[PDB]
Amino acid sequence: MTCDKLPKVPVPPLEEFIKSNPLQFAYVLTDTFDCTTRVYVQPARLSPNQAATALDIRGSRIITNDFVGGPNNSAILNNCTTGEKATWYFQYTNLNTPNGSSYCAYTCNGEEIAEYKCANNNNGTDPLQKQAVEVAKKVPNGDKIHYALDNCPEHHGCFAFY
């Protein structure tokens, strides 16, 4: 019904995300994360805070966010370029099954969904992801959620980057 009431599953251990690398976003809300590959990175050896990092790669450009665990099964992201914070949740995760990995994550503007990222490495075959997206679309501002992998740029010999 509203963004603040969506499911908030536990954040999997970082190792489960690393084992899923790289993932593609099948469904997103803004057009920022169209044609985008996600790679998770462990903290640098010398990092005192030991925050992990989410990489959102679109061609030759990249958006980076450190993240740490927060209350209520949240991930708090710190944009590495702007220092902007955002509180994210997982609607569900299904990492490293015999059919690969998927998850849907979101961040809210009160009752509205501000951003939505559904990732997978199996070309969108997980039944959980289909049901998750249909739920999110009925939340306020979820009408903007759209399939993200149409009319993306041509590749030049790499599978997941371009």
15 binds, among a second copy, Cl ion, none (CB under 5 to 8 A by kind): none
Contact call for residue 31 and a second copy (CB under 8 A): yes
Question: Which letter, b or e, does each residue of 39-51 get, where b requires 16 or more Cβ atoms within 10 Å of its Cβ?
Answer: bbeeeeeeeeeeb
Contact call for residue 97 and a second copy (CB under 8 A): no
Closest contact distance (angstroms) between CB of 8 and a second copy is 18
Residue 80, judged by CB atoms within 10 A of its CB (0-12, 13-18, 19+), counts as middle
Minimum CB distance to Cl ion smaller for 72 or for 154: 72
Nearest to 88 by CA among 102, 58, 64, 68: 68
- The residue number whose beta carbon is nearest to Cl ion equals 117
- Select from 6-14, 87-95, 109-117 the region that touches a second copy (CB under 8 A): 109-117
Minimum CB distance to Cl ion smaller for 75 or for 154: 75
Minimum CB distance to a second copy smaller for 87 or for 162: 162
Contact call for residue 58 and Cl ion (CB under 5 A): no
User: Rounded CA gap, 105 and 11, in Å?
Assistant: 10
Minimum CB distance to a second copy smaller for 10 or for 98: 98
7's enclosing H/E stretch is: none
Q: Which long-range contacts (CB under 8 A, 24 or more apart) does 85-90 make?
A: 86/114, 86/115, 89/6, 89/7, 89/8, 89/9, 90/7, 90/8, 90/9, 90/10, 90/11, 90/12
- Select from 13-21, 39-47, 57-65, 102-110 the region that touches Cl ion (CB under 5 A): 102-110
Give the binding site for a second copy (CB under 8 A): 1-2, 18, 21-22, 31-32, 39, 41-49, 51, 53, 55, 57-66, 78-83, 100-101, 110-112, 121-123, 134, 137-143, 153-162
